[model samples]
Target chain A: AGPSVFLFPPKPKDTLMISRTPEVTCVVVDVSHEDPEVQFNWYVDGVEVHNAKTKPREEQFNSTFRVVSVLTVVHQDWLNGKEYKCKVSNKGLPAPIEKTISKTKGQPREPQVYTLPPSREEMTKNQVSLTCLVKGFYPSDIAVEWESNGQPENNYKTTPPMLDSDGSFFLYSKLTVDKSRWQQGNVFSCSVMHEALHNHYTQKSLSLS
Target chain B: SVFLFPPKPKDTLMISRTPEVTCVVVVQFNWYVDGVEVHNAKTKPRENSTFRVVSVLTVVHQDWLNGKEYKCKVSAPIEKTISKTKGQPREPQVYTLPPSREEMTKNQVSLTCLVKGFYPSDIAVEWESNGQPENNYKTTPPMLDSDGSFFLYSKLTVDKSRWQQGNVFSCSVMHEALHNHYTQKSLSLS
Candidate 1:
């Protein structure tokens, strides 16, 4: 039959581990068969990945590698609505194997979420308890805190499991207060702040229970 | 003598010995140590010295051997015992299994005895008993190479069906050049 090619344990199903900043990498392999040494090159977004950085120092099995390619954004100014691709191939091969990943969207260009204990301008005492539920977009790193007037304030407690199961995080604030203080709605508020892994931060607020 | 780079002694040579697929050894040398040796267990030539070079020798899932010291002591001679005092090694060397024990079995079921990486660097590896041992396996010649050193390899395929049920296989390695100096590692390969 034709020359045999045994590629078991097919390529990893997902390349989700590509860092948030954008990078696809593979381990270096050193193989010498009965014949001569075989060479293969890795590609990303239709472009060949030349070794621009230092060699990969990982010593998997018994090997001495000369080069390594960590896939990255094709170019600095690439389109925002384009797809990311990764491929590997050898010369004379029928076609180069390829994989593509897409950019994330639907997020409010300036998505926001706010939690417990707002600043003096937003706080009023009527509702004694505080709720830290935010809206608009889900941020990667959610920081929940209580602020009194203009300084850092710790006026509450949060529920167990501070992080949610959907990879998103949930934060709650427990404010125990006398309802009499709000007889005329004195001052109590909460603000949920969101800082996604990338970009900047966003904030939202609420007058609590 | 990794580098002819000055520091190397002019008497550079490759002093080495064959390894038993599995077993202890009793070679007369300046460095007397036993197996079950441990080392850095990470990267580098290794930091400690007492651990006989067997730790790094282990090929893990495929083999279990150690090239611990990576240094071999060249004696005055094998028959020429303790009197002359031991001199430095020929150069840097590793004592390795042609095919280690872990690389030997078929599932704790059966195992193929390989005759590899010995001297004459060109002799065949075979299994033998007190004499003409039956049920011995042999492999095709090895792909001889030495990253910067030297080694040989040979293998004998064994069908698990024939040797699994308590079939004891004796291990032996040799070369024509070293007539009576057949190296035998301490082992009871059953």
Candidate 2:
């Protein structure tokens, strides 16, 4: 009887590291006829989430209408592997439409860790660098720590996690230490902490000859 | 609504090389991969008081290598088609790094094959031990370097005892740019 209504599936916005909450938005567009009284429902896992914000419908130049709904969730909840879903219902549609988003799929993968001793070039410098390469992990959040002998060492730099083609992630962490200490055969260890490894950690140790 | 803006290819290179196309003021629009309608496209509001719809087509490297076309059709009989063109293929420099001395003393050893400076991203890597195929290896997705080339690593883990017993391990790579479409590097403790 009138122009067809179109509802786009919900999509999560890019995570802003500075923001405490992340947002997911759903859009309903191309309603040419009467008011449809569109409604949006947000859920975490199976439980319904209230406090979703909806924008007033706006009319386009062709007299059609568009509506948007946004749902914000605590960043910690998202990081803890919670799933979010959005359901859209309208008077013009016979049933509600739903879409879901999650941090990852299937089982989590543990990282393969490797620690390299200072390179020849670095050994020539006043301060030597030891590198730890972490590869093939899922869900991205990882903590890398460096230890000299048995105590914690903090003079280190870590790169942000990089996504791999196989849906995994990788990163590198480097620790700076005095060349004299490295030449004296001081033991250095790089430890990786990840969610997939449960409570345990993967570690690699190296010492210069 | 009418097609205020037609579909245009986004100028972004995804780490996975997945292609994304976007159109402004759109929707009730559909995406097609080689003329077949694709159902999963995203639409959202734009700052100009209009809507922008985006579609990221995930295709296997084989299909992309064969040059498949992607199309976006808006409601007003407006459409745009985009396809990847062939680029200069560069052969990768391959190296197989043997396990460290500490790894040799452990129960397991990891051998890594580093493939770097390759172009046109489609390549294959495999591992073999003692002239037989080995499957327990993990290969990273190709990462674009600052110089527009790409690099990846394939790491294979094996029993330290087997490696110490003089088992030969090799990493073989196949790329269209290679002289024979293949190359390999092997290592053995003995």
Candidate 3:
């Protein structure tokens, strides 16, 4: 006869922040195991954490067990942007399963946008460049686009989001056009998209006389 | 926690710490640069009911300039290794701007050298008056520009008389991307 077989159903292998407050924080992980000698390990930013607690529950008729583990830490650690990881190991399994969690503090802030006409040093006899400055936004993800006279302009370069000294972000986008077009008073605009804005976008426009 | 700060234009520093351990247990740390063992890592214990260990490694500017990897290994409380990767290299653009009219009226003129659009951040800048090395200057730490590159400013202060005499002031820059050649930009009222 074949060795006794046990059927196992798919289970959640995710780690979640079960509780968070100003004074304390707790993260929980659930793992399914058939071996009685299951081990639970927790780490914070690569340092082993020894304060995790584990409790096991038998699954009805499946011959498997569900193990729940929780790691509690000071809320200040989470606020300080530390990473937490949970690892589960079983003698019957070839390797351990791990999950990690991290959170950034505070709500997103909208970006301030402005456009500048080409400086004399940045202008050539045939071409001129316009600059768009987007500053002081949070979460770091943003998009910038350029247009001239309501038409999309392709001759532009947008810089990657850069962190500001205050932990927010800033970026620059430059558009180049024929000097004659700029001298002719064509309106140029820079439009920005970010998560913090209700409309998801804001724009600034400029023209040269 | 193990933390590796961004490499400066010259050197790089890495730190790792062990969780609280019993006071009777001793902790040791080993450092490696690009797979070769480094012996100068410093280790110390923190004051607490349970002892905590801290390890620090400082890598010289040349190795960091060469894009070398760094690893910090700790033993005792538990074994762990933390590693840091090198940044990509990009050449820098240098610009020299003469002192403004407002700056010239103060009995002294400040010549500005702008170094822009460089990656991996490590760079060296020097000032020269004509062919002689000049020392009166201040350079800012590298700051990230919008394009993900770094920009820095070196301001050379010269007496107003020196400016009126038409002394050539040059800003010379050396970067990892430039190999042995220096990018030089010069400005003169003459």
Candidate 4:
């Protein structure tokens, strides 16, 4: 609301970024304000990440950030399927600007990959550990949720993707449906979700035993 | 060489020590460093004290290391006179890396934090791991920007280890003048 304060978005202004094998990209930031300085930080899975320049970089972000603009280091490891996030901040300013990016292989048309961590088939009586993982893409802007028949229709949901430095994203969604309800190979399908905004998943794999 | 006195540190990106707080009449500034001219900004945010001046600029840079040292020359017919830390018909501000990463190694990891733009530039960055104390740290000399707030940096390094299997590293922040505001953050690698 006040023009006197121009807080630049943090490292990743929730602006989307994708990488294939986790490559580092330099960003140019403009802090040509009367204020004169800012803070910066890059994060994955809510963890502050500092690589080659941690010691020489400032925790604040804007003032001592290596890349002035919105620079990104997309984990190419994400090529398999994973989501990573970046956040930028300025201490003297307001909340940092955010960015949601996937370090997918910059190579053209690479399918957005997601790998549901192998269910150890650890289904014991009333409880089951069903974790889903997606690779090659950051899972922020898209819609990749979970669902179970036994649970209330509106309650079929889980957590977000866990970002890996390698570039892939791994997240778990547990469906506590009773093992007794699984009618011998019932359709407890682990779908690669495709909701309104992210209709990119033309194909989904269902592992039902 | 028309036999005239030059600016301080010389040239990179020139700016004033203060903006809004400095009375207005539309002051203009010029910058020069070492002898070459890199960048300069010349404009006023407002016409008088009742109105505030909020002029700003944004640029993209790729270089990991860039220390901009500039000199400024300001002039306002009716507003006021520009008094700089160094000297000049106009005022100037410089940008420099808080600390140098010159002493970096493959086995070691370094972290630097640069801060500026606070009402009173007096913030300090503390280094710690697993909530414990760390000794080896290198800090940058605090410098004043075109704006009144100060700019400075601190550096700390540790042996590169498994970021996931265990150890967590963090930095704590404290306002030098206002110690009441104590905050900290550390890594929780799972």
Per residue, candidate 2 scores C-alpha lDDT tens digits across B33-64 of 79988876665534366545544445444454
Cα RMSD to the true fold for all candidates: 26.9, 13.1, 14.6, 23.4
Candidate 1 regions with alpha-carbon error over 4 angstroms: A1-22, A27-57, A61-68, A72-79, A90-96, A105-109, A117-134, A138-199, A203-209, B1-190
User: lDDT value for candidate 4?
Assistant: 0.37
Best by TM-score: 2
lDDT of 3 by residue, B1-190 (tens): 4443434432222123121111122246666677788777666655335554566665565455455666666543343433333478788867666654444546766676766678767677889986799987766667676568777667676889998898888898977776453578888884
> Chain B TM-score of all predictions, in order?
0.32, 0.58, 0.65, 0.38
lDDT at A151 for candidate 2?
95
> Distance from true position, residue B104, model 4, in Å?
40
CA lDDT of each candidate?
A: 0.33, 0.67, 0.62, 0.37
TM-score for chain A, candidates 1 onward in order: 0.37, 0.53, 0.51, 0.36
Per-residue lDDT for A93 in model 4? 45
Worst 10 residues of 1 chain B by lDDT: B1-10
Question: Which residue runs does candidate 2 get wrong by more than 4 Å?
Answer: A1-20, A24-37, A45-47, A55-68, A75-83, A100-110, A115-194, A197-209, B1-85, B99-106, B129-132, B141-143
RMSD, model 4, all Cα superposed? 23.4
Best by lDDT: 2
Per-residue C-alpha lDDT of model 1 across residues A54-162, encoded as one tens digit per residue: 2433434544322244545432322233454445343433554455554433342222233333222213434244334332234323344555454444445433222
- Binned by DockQ into CAPRI classes (incorrect, acceptable, medium, high), candidate 2 is incorrect
lDDT of 2 by residue, A34-123 (tens): 755777888888799898889988888877788888877675566566887878776666566777776655567887787766545344
